[PDB]
Design a protein around this nucleic acid. Structure first.
Ligand SMILES: [Mg+2]
Ligand SMILES: [Mg+2]
Ligand SMILES: [Mg+2]
Ligand SMILES: [Mg+2]
Ligand SMILES: [Mg+2]
Ligand SMILES: [Mg+2]
Ligand SMILES: [Mg+2]
Ligand SMILES: [Mg+2]
Ligand SMILES: [Mg+2]
Ligand SMILES: [Mg+2]
Ligand SMILES: [Mg+2]
Lengths: 95, 100, 190, 181, 97, 287, 107, 120, 140, 55
RNA sequence: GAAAUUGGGCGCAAUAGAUAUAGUACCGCAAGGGAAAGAUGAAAAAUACCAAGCAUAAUAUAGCAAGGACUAACCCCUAUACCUUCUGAUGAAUUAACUAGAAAUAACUUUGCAAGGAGAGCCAAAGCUAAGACCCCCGAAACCAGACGA
């Protein structure tokens, strides 16, 4: 990525990352599964039910996605009728 | 004007005399110095007399008369270290010079 | 360090003069491969990681840490028995030697920081006496800092400066987080 | 010109050391160098050997007769040494012959005289008194202290220990410094 | 032998100079002069770094946009090449990423 | 304290005595010596010692993780979605108890900013405060709040205690003037008129069930009556008590500040208000 | 190394244990700055330990010179005329006491 | 492949000739082993290095006391080529708190609870 | 040069005081003197083990020579003095061999006497009285 | 904001929390700043406890 | 990668710093490249000791040149030069001087304040602010633009 831009001297986000992923404020990145709209005629319905799911990311995938975006994207977002808003704070962890 | 202090032997009666002259009951050693005029007159008389003044670093520490009494009977003795070493009864094989 | 700006700049290997073509070819000579006579190995070449430009070392501590540092300097000067409080800085005469004799008699120190409330209302006699002295310095109460409280052995306040410092430093305790800068108007601040 | 001061100071003192090794000065006596208190160091010479002296008498044991004469040569612009050294060398000769007659009864007395004239020779007594700080306390004319003078001061110190504390303690002194040679 | 033989002339330092005795004054002009000035308005220097701290690429970017139109011609050219180098260095070279 | 009493016996604090708090200053590690530099941290000569390891996310040639994955619009319209900072009723009872928000006055958004109870930032497109039902039980306050969104249970918790809720609307310009009003009256502009909601939100603010500021004052007792029946409290009438004249005051739409009017120019310096009397300006500002 | 250094045979000074034992240390010469941060532990050594030390062996004559030094030194002189000059630079009082007793104990 | 070696049980069954050779009794055996590492664990498998670390035998030629129980004997059967085992025999009793400090384990294998330094 | 190095004569001279006795340019030039001075210090520490070793074989040569003067061999002498609980070591036996050859002759007589009691004891096998010098002093 | 003797406060907090743990809680006084730092969340218990004490 | 909107020196000090004592000497047909270096003193109307290199002072059986030693320099014994690249050939006569790790997102450590922090903007389900602490040197063939050249 760009660590220091030529105009501002700031970090830049990779906009592929924003266009594909969802940062929950606890640090978990949500994605869609690859191939969830491809060749559905040859996929068993258990597999089609698996592909239509919102799948969390790895630890290193998560830290890789944190480094590829900036602090605007890491921010509390108090939307109106957000569907994912009950998934932001992390309930009841014992680390 | 030299910072040596040697506390007097009649200091109980002098200090008590000043406490009466700023005022007076028995148990006069437990009189609170919460009034600020009373403290200024008492310590101003003692500083005028004894030549030894309560410093700023200690001035809030005396809240009773007994604390001023406990202040004015520490010997603050002030001289150079050449005069402290050479007066500390050196053995005959210590020789101390001060190239100053 | 916040006011500090280093004017040290050197020339890199691109800014130093000349050195645009290879000095000798790549292979045929038995000398070392070089690409310019201005690379950082050459007598006359650029500096590889030297100082670059004016650099400013600016940082602000939070204003509560600066204000607490002024407090801590005041309690330390009072606890070491170096605070002295006057009622006004009005001298009976304007000579310097009176003031050095006074500071020598009361066993103050080598160097005295006199602090009055404003720069306009400093009395003429202390201005004429301390404007000549190297170690006895008049400062307004706005000018009070921590480097020059520690640089000076004694510090001399007047009672209006003491009420000033209590007002300006007990304000930082029990004040809200700012909505906007305090130079702007507020309900109760000036 | 590299800026700075500490390498120039260290280099300045190493140059001073090579100046002292290339051309060393002639050795000055110790009383003409700093850190000398003569009286304190006579008392230290007393307590060093583990005995007591009458300090004035030991002081005259270190004062030669050449020193008074060149001193009065310096006045024009003190008891001597010789009585104590006479008593000390008379005593140490007879007590060394006591020890060496007792522990070697079969020796000829020519051999006891050559042993005793070894243990009071200039080589032995001058080797002993340069390691007991006698030479540093000798008031002599010239430096280094010439060996006949220092022999005289050493037996003056024996005479002063004799008049101080009797014949038995000097017998232990002579035993512990002259016989162990 | 790159070491000097005579020790240098002495460094007379006047600690009670005008500048040293009055160093640090008006660092607290904000917090006890009713916040009318900021202390960053006390520092004097280049106009592009009065009250600003950055690394070198940011000092060069800010120098170019704040004073670069009236810079000299080959100084402006050297500075554009420095931003072009320091760009290609910070963004493509290093150990941590 | 024993500690200043220690400072009596110690030498004076100078610029030669100071030392950082141990733990503050890690030492700089720099590549000289047997351990910090021979290879100097980079390892053996490859591409990571030369300095030229490729960009973040390059997996060496296979298609990267962050590109094997379908683009889905999680963040599709993110910067035009509206945000509303929560204000719980536990928070607002907390502000009322500590004197920070006066409940004997109307509680507009300016009064929650000046008591610093709620920080909203109009850039990063917060459109205001939403009331939050947290702390509805143990909320004991008669209050008059103007909050841009409100859940039904938070309206019920206020209106049980003798309160009045209304939901106003603010433009980002208007909300920005509302939050920090004093840096607007140093801007020299006349007070603007706040705009009506967009088409998404007109059906919100014209409904009496969620207490819209554009709704009827003839349909409100039906909705207050309905929540009082739903959540089981007998609806007190605001008309009886003495704060009623306070609990009725609303600023109309197209009014940003409370006692002021659009088009006025507040002169903060000599404490005046310049008011326009030209008819074209009065047609424009009272529209 | 041993081939670069000179060597010697183990000896005494004047058969130092045979008849009696003689303390081989004549003079110590401390030089201590009055104002100076390197001779702090020397200062607290003269104030605390040098009188006790000077009483524990009276055949040693001790000179505390107390000039403006920038490095403080101790200069031990021995009965056979050797001089060991060691520094007490930036040392604690306990480290100076073990050094001075080290110089006392040796020859 | 070089693998871990099980050892069959007939290897660990004494014969009365061995009771005549060594000094053992099959009825009423000894309680405590003395184990001593006498052959390095280097150039040995990592499991034997571990068993030497568990038994407390990282120093060579230093005795260690163990129990004569089948678990400790199982670990000792893993590393029986690196160690030496003797029975801890005790001529007098086990040491009470009076004789706790004045013991000495002799080289015979016995642990004497009064260790004077005087000849008999 | 902001801060270039002033104090470099002394780093060189810390190495070169160890090389003042070498040959060739190793006593002079720092690049050569460092390799030889390091290499001399490595030898200087590995030679502690060889000092101990070579003293011990020197002592075995001296004990071997002096015990061959009395007919014994070295293994006979050392073995049968261990067997007498004479726990002298090699340093002491070599120094007695040089400086006190009567004590060494009597130790050779004690070791050959014990050697013959070992022969006659391990010849007439069975229960017999032990030799006189064959007895051991039990320590408990 | 602990002003005074922090070691009495460490004794009394450590006597208060050890029935809620079994063991003594592992703490750290910072006598310079005047803080006291306990391991594990005990915020509501110490706020209630310090309201009982009168602070 | 926008916009609305907002509002003298903790420099160098003669291999450094300018290439600069000079765009000179020199090199090139030309465009163009491009040096090096000075040190007395108040007065010249007062004429030390230290790099490598040698010399004073050539050499003596045997061997990475040393180490253990030793009465003794050598003789005795021990000892497969250093860097770098490989699992285990490269470069260096030698001295002096010059010559290569630059970024504070997140985490950590230390303070301040704390449901708030921050000297507007920003973050906040114990956070925020401040600081400390992490990211090298040299080296092609080339490509392009504009000149100078028969
Ligand atoms: Mg170029
Ligand atoms: Mg190139
Ligand atoms: Mg240059
Ligand atoms: Mg703009
Ligand atoms: Mg130059
Ligand atoms: Mg040049
Ligand atoms: Mg030379
Ligand atoms: Mg050989
Ligand atoms: Mg070659
Ligand atoms: Mg070099
Ligand atoms: Mg032609």
């Amino acid at each position: 990525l760009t660590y220091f831009s030529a105009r501002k001297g700031k970090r830049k986000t990779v906009k592929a990352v924003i266009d594909r992923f969802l940062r929950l404020h606890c640090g978990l990145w949500v994605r869609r599964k690859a191939g969830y709209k491809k060749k559905l005629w040859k996929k068993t319905p258990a597999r089609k039910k698996r592909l239509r799911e919102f799948v969390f990311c790895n630890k290193t995938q998560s830290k890789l996605l944190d480094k590829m975006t900036t602090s605007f994207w890491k921010r509390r977002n108090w939307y109106v009728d957000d569907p994912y808003q009950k998934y932001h704070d992390r309930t009841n962890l014992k680390v | 004007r030299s910072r040596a202090y040697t506390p007097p032997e009649d200091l109980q009666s002098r200090l008590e005399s000043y406490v009466k002259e700023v005022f007076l009951p028995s148990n006069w050693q437990d009189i609170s110095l919460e009034d600020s005029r009373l403290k200024f007159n008492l310590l101003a008389h003692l500083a005028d007399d004894l030549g030894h003044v309560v410093p700023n670093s200690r001035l809030h520490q005396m809240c009773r008369v007994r604390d001023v009494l406990d202040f004015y009977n520490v010997p603050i003795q002030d001289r150079s270290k050449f005069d402290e070493l050479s007066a500390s009864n050196l053995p005959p094989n210590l020789k101390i010079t001060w190239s100053y | 360090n916040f006011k500090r700006i280093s004017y040290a700049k050197t020339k890199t290997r691109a800014e130093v003069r000349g050195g645009g073509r290879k000095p000798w070819p790549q292979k045929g000579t038995g000398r070392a491969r070089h690409g310019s006579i201005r690379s950082p190995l050459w007598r006359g070449g650029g500096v590889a990681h030297g100082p670059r430009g004016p650099t400013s070392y600016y940082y602000m501590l939070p204003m509560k840490v600066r204000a607490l540092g002024l407090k801590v300097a005041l309690t330390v000067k009072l606890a070491q028995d170096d605070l002295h409080i006057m009622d006004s800085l009005e001298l009976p005469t304007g000579d310097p030697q009176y003031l050095t004799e006074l500071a020598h008699y009361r066993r103050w120190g080598d160097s005295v920081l006199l602090v009055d409330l404003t720069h306009e209302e400093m009395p003429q006699s202390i201005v004429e006496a301390t404007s000549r002295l190297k170690t006895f310095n008049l400062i307004p109460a706005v000018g009070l800092n921590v480097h020059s409280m520690l640089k000076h052995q004694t510090l001399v306040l007047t009672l209006p400066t003491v009420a000033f410092l209590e007002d300006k430093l007990l304000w930082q305790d029990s004040r809200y987080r700012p909505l906007y800068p305090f130079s702007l108007p507020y309900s109760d601040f000036p | 010109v590299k800026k700075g001061f500490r390498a120039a100071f260290r280099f300045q003192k190493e140059l001073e050391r090579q100046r002292l090794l290339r051309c060393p000065p002639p050795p000055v006596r110790r009383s003409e160098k700093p850190n000398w208190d003569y009286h304190a160091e006579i008392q230290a010479f007393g307590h060093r050997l583990q005995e007591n002296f009458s300090l004035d008498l030991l002081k005259t044991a270190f004062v030669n007769s050449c020193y008074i004469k060149s001193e009065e040569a310096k006045r024009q612009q003190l008891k001597s040494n010789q009585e104590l050294s006479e008593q000390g060398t008379s005593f140490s000769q007879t007590c060394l012959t006591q020890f060496l007659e007792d522990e070697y009864p079969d020796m000829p007395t020519e051999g006891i005289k050559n042993l005793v004239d070894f243990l009071t020779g200039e080589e032995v007594v001058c080797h002993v008194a340069r390691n007991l700080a006698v030479e540093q306390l000798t008031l002599s004319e010239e430096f280094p202290v010439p060996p006949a003078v220092l022999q005289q001061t050493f037996f003056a110190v024996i005479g002063a220990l004799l008049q101080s504390s009797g014949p038995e303690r000097t017998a232990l002194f002579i035993r512990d410094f002259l016989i162990t040679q | 032998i790159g070491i000097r033989l005579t020790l240098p002339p002495p460094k007379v330092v006047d600690r009670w100079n005008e500048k040293r005795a009055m160093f640090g004054v008006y660092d607290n002009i904000g917090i006890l002069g009713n916040f009318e000035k900021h202390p960053k308005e006390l520092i004097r220097g280049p106009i592009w770094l009065r009250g600003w701290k950055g690394n070198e690429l940011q000092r060069c970017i800010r120098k170019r946009k704040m004073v670069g139109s009236r810079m000299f011609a080959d100084d402006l050219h050297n500075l554009n090449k420095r931003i072009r180098y320091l760009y290609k260095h910070f963004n493509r070279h290093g150990k941590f990423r | 304290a024993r500690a200043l009493d220690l400072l009596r016996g110690l030498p004076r604090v100078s610029l030669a005595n100071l030392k950082p708090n141990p733990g503050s200053k890690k030492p700089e590690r720099r590549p000289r010596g047997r351990r910090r530099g021979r290879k100097c941290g980079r390892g053996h000569k490859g591409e990571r010692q030369r300095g030229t390891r490729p960009r973040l996310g390059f997996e060496g040639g296979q298609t990267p993780f962050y590109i094997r994955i379908p683009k889905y619009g999680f963040n599709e319209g993110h910067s035009f979605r509206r945000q509303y900072k929560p204000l719980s009723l536990n928070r607002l009872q907390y502000l009322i108890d500590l004197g920070r928000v006066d409940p004997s006055q109307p509680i507009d958004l300016t009064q929650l900013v000046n008591g610093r109870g709620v920080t909203i930032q109009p850039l990063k497109r917060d459109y205001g405060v939403q009331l939050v039902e947290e702390g509805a039980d143990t909320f004991t306050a008669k209050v008059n709040i103007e909050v841009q969104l409100a859940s039904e249970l938070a309206i019920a918790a206020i209106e049980k205690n003798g309160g009045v809720v209304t939901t106003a609307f603010y433009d980002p310009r208007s909300l920005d003037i509302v939050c920090k009003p004093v840096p607007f009256f140093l801007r020299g502009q006349p007070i603007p008129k706040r705009m009506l909601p967009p088409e998404e939100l007109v059906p919100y603010y014209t409904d009496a069930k969620n207490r819209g500021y554009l709704a009827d004052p003839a349909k409100f007792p039906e909705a207050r009556l309905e929540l009082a029946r739903k959540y089981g409290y007998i609806l007190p009438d605001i008309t009886k008590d003495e704060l009623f004249k306070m609990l009725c005051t609303r600023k109309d739409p197209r009014q940003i500040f409370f006692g002021l009017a659009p088009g006025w120019v507040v002169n903060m310096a000599d404490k005046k208000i310049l008011k326009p009397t030209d008819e074209n300006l009065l047609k424009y500002y009272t529209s | 190394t041993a081939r670069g250094t000179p060597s010697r045979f183990l000896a005494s000074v004047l058969h130092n244990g045979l008849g009696r034992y003689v303390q081989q240390l004549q003079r110590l010469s401390f030089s201590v700055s009055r104002d100076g941060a390197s001779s702090r532990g020397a200062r607290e050594f003269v104030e605390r330990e040098v009188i006790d030390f000077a009483r524990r062996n009276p055949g040693v004559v001790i000179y505390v010179n107390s000039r403006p030094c920038c490095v403080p030194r101790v200069v031990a002189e021995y009965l056979n005329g050797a001089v060991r000059e060691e520094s007490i630079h930036c040392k604690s009082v306990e480290e100076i006491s073990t050094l001075v007793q080290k110089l006392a104990d040796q020859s | 492949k070089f693998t871990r070696s099980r050892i069959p049980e007939k290897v660990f069954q004494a014969s009365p000739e061995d009771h005549e050779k060594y000094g053992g009794d099959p009825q009423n055996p000894h309680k405590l082993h003395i184990v001593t590492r006498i052959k390095s664990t280097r150039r040995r498998p990592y499991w034997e290095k571990d068993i030497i670390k568990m038994l407390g035998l990282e120093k060579a030629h230093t005795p260690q006391v163990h129990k004569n129980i089948p678990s400790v004997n199982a670990k000792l059967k893993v590393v029986k080529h690196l160690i030496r085992i003797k029975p801890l025999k005790l001529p007098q009793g086990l040491p009470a708190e009076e004789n706790m400090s004045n013991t000495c384990l002799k080289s015979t294998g016995e642990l004497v609870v009064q260790w004077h330094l005087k000849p008999v | 040069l902001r801060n270039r190095v002033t104090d470099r004569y002394f780093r060189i001279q810390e190495v070169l005081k160890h090389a003042r006795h070498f040959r060739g340019r190793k006593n002079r030039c720092y690049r050569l003197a460092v390799r030889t001075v390091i290499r001399a210090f490595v030898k200087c520490t590995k030679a502690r083990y060889l000092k101990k070793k070579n003293m011990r074989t020197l002592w075995i040569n001296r004990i071997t020579a002096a015990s061959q003067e009395h007919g014994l061999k070295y293994p006979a002498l050392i073995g049968n003095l261990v067997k007498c609980q004479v726990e002298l070591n090699r340093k002491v036996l070599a120094d007695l061999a040089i400086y006190e050859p009567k004590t060494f002759k009597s130790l050779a007589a004690l070791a050959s006497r014990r050697r013959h009691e070992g022969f006659a004891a391990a010849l007439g096998d069975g229960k017999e009285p032990e030799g006189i010098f064959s007895r051991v002093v039990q320590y408990h | 904001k602990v002003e005074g003797d922090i070691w009495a406060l460490q004794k009394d907090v450590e006597d208060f929390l050890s029935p809620l743990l079994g063991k003594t809680p592992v703490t750290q006084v910072n006598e310079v700043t005047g803080t006291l730092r306990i391991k594990g969340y005990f915020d509501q218990e110490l706020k209630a406890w310090l309201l009982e004490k009168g602070f």
